[PDB]
Each structure stands twice: as C-alpha cells, then as structure tokens.
Design a protein around this ligand. Sequence first.
Ligand SMILES: CC1=C(/C=C/C(C)=C/C=C/C(C)=C/C=C/C=C(C)/C=C/C=C(C)/C=C/C2=C(C)C(=O)CCC2(C)C)C(C)(C)CCC1=O
Ligand SMILES: CC1=C(/C=C/C(C)=C/C=C/C(C)=C/C=C/C=C(C)/C=C/C=C(C)/C=C/C2=C(C)C(=O)CCC2(C)C)C(C)(C)CCC1=O
Lengths: 306, 308
Amino acid sequence: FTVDSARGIFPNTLTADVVPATIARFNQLNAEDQLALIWFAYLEMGKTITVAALGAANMQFAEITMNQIRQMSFQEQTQVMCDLANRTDTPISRAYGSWTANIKLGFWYQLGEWMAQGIVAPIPSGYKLSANAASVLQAIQGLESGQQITVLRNCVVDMGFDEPVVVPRDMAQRTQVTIEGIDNPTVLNYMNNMNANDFEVLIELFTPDGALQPPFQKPIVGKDAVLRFFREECQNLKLIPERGVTEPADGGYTQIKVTGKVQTPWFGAGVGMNMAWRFLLSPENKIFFVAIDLLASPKELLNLVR
Amino acid sequence: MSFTVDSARGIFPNTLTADVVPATIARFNQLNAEDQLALIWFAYLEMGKTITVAALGAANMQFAEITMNQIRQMSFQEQTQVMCDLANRTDTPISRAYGSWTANIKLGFWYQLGEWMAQGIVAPIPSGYKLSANAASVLQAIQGLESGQQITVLRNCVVDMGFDEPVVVPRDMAQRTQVTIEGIDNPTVLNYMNNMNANDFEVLIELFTPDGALQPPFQKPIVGKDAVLRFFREECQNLKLIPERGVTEPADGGYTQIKVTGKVQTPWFGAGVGMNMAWRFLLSPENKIFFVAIDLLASPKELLNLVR
Ligand SMILES: CC1=C(/C=C/C(C)=C/C=C/C(C)=C/C=C/C=C(C)/C=C/C=C(C)/C=C/C2=C(C)C(=O)CCC2(C)C)C(C)(C)CCC1=O
Ligand SMILES: CC1=C(/C=C/C(C)=C/C=C/C(C)=C/C=C/C=C(C)/C=C/C=C(C)/C=C/C2=C(C)C(=O)CCC2(C)C)C(C)(C)CCC1=O
C-alpha cells in the first residue's frame, strides 16, 4: 500500500460532495455578495453558537486586528471585510491568513455580534443578492445542518491571505467510546484520545509515515504534519462513533470502517455531523492511513459493506 | 475614479452563469486518481462530439512528443502510474513537463493517450473497474449537462492536472468578417469581437485602459494590458465569437455598461459545440475597456436575459 492507494478503501462510502460543490459556487460570487450571503445564511441558521471554542490565548491573536477594525469608519470596515473575502494582499488579510481556523471563526463571530450592535458596518439595507448568489443561498438552506455548517466554516477559513498548547482532559474525567462490532484498541483509543484532546498520545498510534485525510482535503502525511494538524485544528471535538466493520486487506493490513456522529464545540449537541472513519492499519496494528468523511445523508450511517 | 476592477465584476448581476461547472469540477477533485481517469474515460466516450483534424495535428505537440513516446514505450504498469501522477499533481519529471505545457498541448496529449488506449498501446481503464459511489454520481451529473458545459468540465479537469508557443498570425483584413449585434452599434464592442475573431491581439489590446482587466469564465480578473495580452496570446486563439443580442446602459461617471449574449465555438470542436456566453463590458467615457467579463451561461434561456 501507498497513501494514494489507501485513499480508496471502502469506495462505496457516499460522501457529501455537495459541500465542496457549493463552496465552489460561492467562490464565483463577488466579495459583497459573499459577505451578504453568509450574513443571511447565518441569521437564518436556527443553530446557536457557543464560543468555548476559540479561547483566550487563541483569540488574543486576533485582538489587535479586531481593535483596528473597531476604530475604522463603516466604509473602511467594509473594505477590510471585502479584502478578506477577495483574499487580497493587505496587512490585515495576511494577519488573518496566519491564524488557525478557530481563531478566524471567532474573529468573524465577534464582527457578526458588532454588526447586530451597530459597532461594525452592516449588510446594506435592502441589499439584493445577484441571481447566482440567491441560488447558492437557497442551496445552502436546503442542506442538512451538518453540511450547512461545513460550508460556512470552509468559506470563512478560505478567506484572507495575500498555536498555544492544549492540555488533555484529566484521566479520571475521560469518557470511553463503545463501537458496535469494533474491539481494536487502536481504533478505540484513536477516538478516546481525540475526545480527551490527548494528541501527544494519539500520534503514537500512527506509523511514522502514516497519513490522515480530513473531509474534502488531501492526505496529511507523516507524524510531524499529522501532529501539527491535531494541535491546530482538532481541539474540543466530540466523536460519537456508533458501529464498524473490520476486514483483512492485502499484505497483512487491516481495513476498518466506522460510522457515527461528530459534534464541534461551536454548536455542541445542536449539530451532529454524520461521519465515517476509514482506517488502514499496518500488520503491527498502527494507523497507516485514516480518512474522515462527511457522509451524504443519514442513510450512509448504515453502509458498512466490507 | 468611479470604478475599481473589483466593483466592475458585479455589472449585470442578474446574469445567471453555469456555476454547475465549477461545482462539478469540485466534486471531481474529491475522487482519487484512478477514479478520475476512469470517470473521464466514460464521460469522454458518452459525449458524441468529435475533435477536429486541425487541432489534432497542432504543431505545438512537438513540445510533448518526447514525453508521449516515452510513455508509449513504458509498461502498462508504468503508464498507469504516470497517468495517476498527472491526476494527483505529483512532483515528477513527467508531471513537471506536463505542468510546463500550455492548455492546448495538455489537451492534445490526453487525446493521443486516449487514442492509444483504444488501440491497445496505452494501459486501458481495467476491464473490471467499478467507479466509486461518488464517481458514478459525478459521471451522471456530467452526462446531464449541455455539451458546452461538459466540454468545459473536461477541459478544466485536464488543465488542472500535472505541475509539482508561436502566436497565431492575424487574418488579413480583406478576409475578415464583421459581426452584427441586435441592439449594439458601439464600435469598441464590435472591434473587440472582430479583432478576437481575427486573432489581432495587438490591435485588440489597444481597446483597454492601462488599468483594465479581463475576466474569463470562472477565473479571476486579469489586470493590466501586459497580463491581458499574454492571456490573449496564450489562450484565445482561433475562437469563433458569434454575438447576437445586446443592451447598453449608462454607468457612473460617464461610463457605459454593455451586455452581449451569443455563442462561442472553440477550435477543438468547431461547429459541433456552441457555448452560450455573455460578455459584460464596462467602457470608460473615452470608449476604452476598463473591464470585460466573459461568462458561460446557465442555459439557453439566459441568451434573452438582457435587463439591467
Ligand atoms: C464570515 C461572515 C460572518 C460570520 C459568519 C460566522 C461567525 C460563521 C461561523 C461558522 C461556524 C462557527 C462554523 C463551524 C463549523 C465547524 C465544523 C464544520 C467542524 C467540523 C469538524 C469536523 C468534521 C472534525 C472532524 C475530525 C474527526 C472526527 C477526526 O477523527 C480527525 C480530525 C478531524 C478534524 C478530521 C457574518 C455573519 C459577520 C457576515 C459576513 C461574513 O462574511
Ligand atoms: C484526460 C483523460 C482522457 C482524455 C480526455 C480528453 C481528450 C479531453 C478533451 C477535452 C477537450 C478537447 C475540451 C475542450 C474544451 C474547450 C473549451 C471549453 C473552450 C472554451 C473557450 C471559450 C469558452 C472561449 C472563451 C473566450 C471569449 C469568448 C472571449 O471573448 C475572451 C477570451 C475567452 C478565451 C475567455 C482519457 C479519455 C484518455 C481518459 C483518461 C483521462 O483522464
């Protein structure tokens, strides 16, 4: 096996490719339509946000920028927001591009609160989305909540351009998952370490050259890059695996598929995303490859075909 | 100034473009390399459209001759790996060579490989290959698109693989034709269309302001005469522009906004495929192009969408 050959295990897992499709549609819209579309989608999303994600040492990184924006006029604020959407090369857009996803999300959450408070320039009254933007908004509002929030997140994170430590949860307070059909400690402890933010232990489950493929992204290859990804993107998730299957693969490898739900700290139990994990484990029972997929619909939770 | 390039992008915002094309490309980009190759094989086979002899013998293929002949001599296993390296945008000598090529060389390369696949010279899509669930759905989506949208999906997928010519002679004035656009007599728009059809890019570039920009379908504004002229020379050769209808309206500061709808034919398919397009011009008071966007329209209905 190579990483690229591992990518196709369990090939009839149907993923929610409407998400990258919809993001690509959003990417065609001009900056003002993008900002207005997100405003409308966000307001109409009946899902309340918790800002336990993006903590203090993290959000300290965007404080300077947020203080700059808070001192500009409504016209300068609008230009900055458009520079972000346009991925323009400006000092603030470069600052934004340096941040992790949760810092970017917390930044926009604060601007959104200030917009409802009149502290930051609002979407102009009586604004009309372009014909294409109106159709993108309608498509988003037809998606399952888990897909809606992934579209919004990825659009936010793609904006801009030109990590404090995470201490794991105390052992006594930790939960342990139960996965129907799966007894393998490498899979069980992948989930338990994730749920405890115990990334320095989790990385030891991988082969030295092992790879992790997040939803709609390319494989991240090797312990150094995977550990960096854990530390930067994976804090405070709740993984709720339900059921899985295991089967032998070529050369003494083992392939395992698990389905279940994931909650993000931004929405807690209010949004459950339907996920699959597809593992290829080495003969020594280490993770050579794991893919994490956002599933097309709840019907895919029952698709456990070997 | 009354406009910036980014503020010009939104002119005629009721124009409904075929964003199903970038959406479907994004779905295709989720598939692994072998699935991508098989999907394009079946999509290319299901299309009933023929590539022209004039594009088939394109002299620029000499840049790719050595690489193709190398591939032809490889084993089927090596050939498959090369093709996957291309789909994966891997850093290899062959993928770097492909990434150095122009779009037209890239298309001719894959046309030749596909011919060789049918002739038993290059490794075929394996006989017992089953598309993934996602890939089968993407293939079904492509089959439901208008041919002009199908070929745009296929072209963009080809051009995006890999990584890690002489300019056409303008046609003699005596041999040129003149477009006719119902509703539009603006000479800058007519001159844009006629110079494009004549491959007279050095005259065409003089129609733009120095800070002026051109926005190709599903791409970002290309800003400045140097960048735009390089784009004309590299990409826009031997097209046939068939504008039919248009509307002109005043814009701020004495500018003029013009929308034209019509059809475009690529030299790859000749008259076999007519893509429904809009051109959206923002002209300075001095009659120069400050911004022009070229859109692939969502459906033929949009040819009649000529409201402000
Ligand atoms: C932008 C903007 C606004 C603001 C808008 C705002 C504030 C928008 C905020 C939107 C928010 C807070 C979106 C958060 C989405 C989080 C997701 C999808 C996390 C998924 C994680 C997953 C699947 C993890 C999976 C994982 C598992 C299971 C593993 O096993 C391995 C790890 C891995 C990570 C792969 C305004 C409202 C101001 C209007 C203007 C404007 O433009
Ligand atoms: C890859 C592959 C294969 C091969 C597949 C093959 C051979 C695929 C070949 C596909 C081909 C030949 C696609 C050609 C597409 C051309 C288009 C959309 C031109 C558009 C031009 C336009 C819109 C003009 C626009 C213009 C106007 C009007 C302006 O006014 C301004 C300029 C501008 C340019 C913007 C196999 C079958 C071997 C399988 C394996 C595999 O993977």
